[PDB]
């Protein structure tokens, strides 16, 4: 989508697996904020927004 | 031949969705209970 019309997906009632992502190479930037990418695939959310 | 599902009008904000295998003189006999515990 365009950026003023930004995508918005709700993520629920799965599980993520954050390491496949982190372990990419085709990824440029991974910055993460308020939350370590180490402890991401142990802890839980209600819900993402993508 | 079930033709006629008149049930809503609408369905704006989704939250879950889940899609089961069918739980089903009168024949059959079901029993539920449900219950709203911690959500
Ligand atoms: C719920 O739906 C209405 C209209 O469909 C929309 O304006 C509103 O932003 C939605 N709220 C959420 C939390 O999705």
């Avoid at chain 1, 950026?3 to 992502?21: E, G, M, P, T």
């Avoid at chain 2, 904000?13 to 539920?32: A, G, H, I």
Wanted: with cysteine; charged share 20%; hydrophobic share 35%.
């Amino acid at each position: 989508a365009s950026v003023y019309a930004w995508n918005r997906k709700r993520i629920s009632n799965c599980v993520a697996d954050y390491s496949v992502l982190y372990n990419s190479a085709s990824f440029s930037t991974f910055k993460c904020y308020g939350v370590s990418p180490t402890k991401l695939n142990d802890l839980c959310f209600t819900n993402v927004y993508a | 031949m079930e033709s006629e599902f008149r049930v809503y009008s609408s369905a704006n904000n989704c939250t879950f969705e889940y899609v089961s295998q069918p739980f089903l003189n009168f024949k059959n006999l079901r029993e539920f209970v449900f219950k709203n515990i911690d959500g």
